[PDB]
Design an enzyme around this catalytic site. Structure first.
Site, PDB file in Angstrom:
ATOM      1  N   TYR B  37       0.829  -1.163   0.000  1.00  0.00           N
ATOM      2  CA  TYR B  37       0.000   0.000   0.000  1.00  0.00           C
ATOM      3  C   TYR B  37       0.893   1.253   0.000  1.00  0.00           C
ATOM      4  CZ  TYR B  37       1.248   0.860   4.762  1.00  0.00           C
ATOM      5  OH  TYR B  37       1.994   1.062   5.917  1.00  0.00           O
ATOM      6  N   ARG B  60       7.844   5.127  -4.397  1.00  0.00           N
ATOM      7  CA  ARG B  60       7.899   4.143  -3.308  1.00  0.00           C
ATOM      8  C   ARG B  60       6.929   3.023  -3.563  1.00  0.00           C
ATOM      9  NH1 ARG B  60       8.354   6.093   2.588  1.00  0.00           N
ATOM     10  NH2 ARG B  60       6.114   6.557   2.260  1.00  0.00           N
ATOM     11  N   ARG B 113      -6.092 -21.010  -3.661  1.00  0.00           N
ATOM     12  CA  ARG B 113      -5.199 -20.785  -2.510  1.00  0.00           C
ATOM     13  C   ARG B 113      -4.000 -21.698  -2.605  1.00  0.00           C
ATOM     14  NH1 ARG B 113      -4.179 -22.690   2.783  1.00  0.00           N
ATOM     15  NH2 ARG B 113      -3.355 -21.001   4.095  1.00  0.00           N
ATOM     16  N   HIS B 115       0.518 -21.049  -1.611  1.00  0.00           N
ATOM     17  CA  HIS B 115       1.425 -19.994  -1.074  1.00  0.00           C
ATOM     18  C   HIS B 115       2.221 -19.312  -2.206  1.00  0.00           C
ATOM     19  CE1 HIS B 115       0.313 -21.850   2.719  1.00  0.00           C
ATOM     20  NE2 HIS B 115       0.917 -20.885   3.391  1.00  0.00           N
ATOM     21  N   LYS B 155       6.480  -2.134   2.666  1.00  0.00           N
ATOM     22  CA  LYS B 155       5.191  -1.508   3.046  1.00  0.00           C
ATOM     23  C   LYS B 155       3.995  -2.448   2.700  1.00  0.00           C
ATOM     24  CE  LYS B 155       4.209   3.311   2.366  1.00  0.00           C
ATOM     25  NZ  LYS B 155       3.556   3.502   3.667  1.00  0.00           N
ATOM     26  N   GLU B 187      10.407   1.491  15.326  1.00  0.00           N
ATOM     27  CA  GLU B 187       9.418   2.375  14.736  1.00  0.00           C
ATOM     28  C   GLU B 187       8.091   2.319  15.464  1.00  0.00           C
ATOM     29  OE1 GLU B 187       8.091  -0.906  11.270  1.00  0.00           O
ATOM     30  OE2 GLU B 187       9.469   0.709  10.800  1.00  0.00           O
ATOM     31  N   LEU B 211      17.863   2.237   1.726  1.00  0.00           N
ATOM     32  CA  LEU B 211      16.548   2.247   2.336  1.00  0.00           C
ATOM     33  C   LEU B 211      16.381   3.401   3.308  1.00  0.00           C
ATOM     34  CD1 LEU B 211      16.135  -1.508   3.041  1.00  0.00           C
ATOM     35  CD2 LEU B 211      15.210  -0.219   1.091  1.00  0.00           C
TER      36      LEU B 211
END
Ligand code: CA
Lengths: 281, 290
Positions: B37, B60, B113, B115, B155, B187, B211
């Protein structure tokens, strides 16, 4: 033809065809990976279908729910009935003699996007029943190839595991065995064990089928750190999961495990597994 | 009235009211938390709206997708266009002067489904534009309260850990949880943490300098404009508790002063001079782009 699935959103429930099952976009399972899952294998003998260890699976599901603050929407009887109706409704889709795997997911539900728990969200529940093909006789005869790479709840925040599963596919391997600070953790979708000098070893910690099978065979079990050297010098390496049952690992990063053939603790645990399945059927 | 949102599933796209937006149950965002996101502030001067640092947010986003192998469905222009359609479609529901925040989520798509990456899934895109209330003038004057707890560079939407830490803060009546691993500051659940000590601005290190530059670019820029030395360096628990100032930043918070920590004052309990300067700089960055 089409699989039928169960979906409960905002306390409304339905069994619907797979192509009609959709969840609201603000469901916290989609936005945040904020949910848990559990699986139940369903073994078939003709039209006779029987869940395997459904009590222990459902008990782990209740524990995962509580560990993250999500109201369990059913008692045990409600969960088993949900599973029975779902399996029944897929009888045709699956067909006679077809083993199945039941997948159950519960998320914290739908709300305005905000990280903390919403005041009034109702949990979403999704479940489905899919054909299960166990590992083949040849696979058990040959063993599988695993690779290694750098690395207590069954959550759906699984990106890490997705990436390690893809890593294994890219390396023509059945599984990636992860190492954290030099010590074995687990597979992308399986538990890892080693055998050394007749002792079954797993990393430090209850759902515990493999320990129960080891106890039954009289095989001593120790829970301790397994470092990279001990992994590579194992007498045997094993994978377990609901879908794999138990598989022997015979190659590890292109080197043979011991003689490169499945060992006797594998044989013993595998037979004890199948007797537990016979017991339930 | 009701927010209008963008949803693209299996190559079909729509702008629909929030209450009509639904995703297939086998979407890997829902099943595996397999997606990323990015958020873009949209600032309003009356009926005028402007995205803040759109190029950097979209770079990003692109990195996040590349990092986890999801085929990026748009070039930068496609993403710019998507953000404009969406903001425009919410003009009326937002109203004049009402700041917004666009949330973009991209997952690996829908499939049986399993992995590993599915061969034929197409990425799912969801985007929404929500009203943004910035922290008040009060909150900036009082400062906020954080707690600490025991605690990498994607993210992603596999955010259960962040959810739990956010809820821990809520349960202790605090705005954020500052996480510690091995006695060092990592963080916040949804914010980046900074300390000031002897007029120097300090942020936790990341996995490497590349980074760090992506992550700290805006504040690094603000600090340079202010002539405030910045370093990326471990902050141990005692260094955190002895700090002259502690700060949070995020898209929704801009910058906030932390003036209380595990129920003890941070120095005087007053916001400090490095916060004042950075905040002012932030506001000149906004005005300039507007
Ligand atoms: Ca056979």
């Amino acid at each position: 033809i089409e699989p039928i699935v169960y979906l409960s959103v905002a306390s409304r429930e339905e069994l619907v065809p797979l192509s009609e099952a959709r969840v609201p976009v603000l469901d916290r399972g989609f936005i945040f990976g904020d949910g848990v899952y559990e699986v139940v294998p369903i073994y078939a003998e003709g039209a006779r279908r029987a869940p395997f260890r459904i009590a222990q699976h459902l008990a782990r599901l209740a524990r995962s729910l509580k560990k993250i603050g999500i109201a369990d929407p059913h008692d045990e009887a409600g969960w088993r009935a949900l599973v029975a109706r779902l399996v029944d409704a897929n009888a045709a889709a699956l067909g006679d003699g077809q083993h199945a795997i039941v997948y159950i997911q519960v998320t914290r539900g739908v709300a305005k996007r905000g990280h903390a728990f919403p005041a009034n969200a109702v949990p979403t529940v999704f479940a489905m029943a899919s054909p299960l093909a166990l590992p083949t006789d040849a696979q058990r005869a040959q063993g599988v190839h695993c690779v290694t790479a750098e690395d207590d709840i069954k959550s759906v925040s699984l990106l890490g595991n997705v990436l390690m599963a893809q890593h294994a596919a890219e390396h023509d391997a059945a599984e990636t065995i992860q190492l954290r600070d030099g010590n074995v953790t687990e597979g992308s979708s399986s538990n890892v064990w080693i055998v050394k000098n007749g002792e079954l070893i797993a990393p430090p910690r209850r759902y515990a089928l493999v320990e129960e099978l080891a106890e039954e065979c009289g095989i001593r079990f120790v829970a301790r750190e397994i470092n990279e050297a001990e992994l590579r010098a194992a007498d045997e390496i094993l994978l377990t999961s609901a879908t794999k049952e138990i598989l022997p690992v015979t190659r590890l990063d292109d080197l043979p495990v011991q003689g490169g053939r499945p060992g006797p603790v594998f044989d013993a645990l595998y037979a004890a597994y199948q007797r537990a399945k016979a017991h339930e059927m």
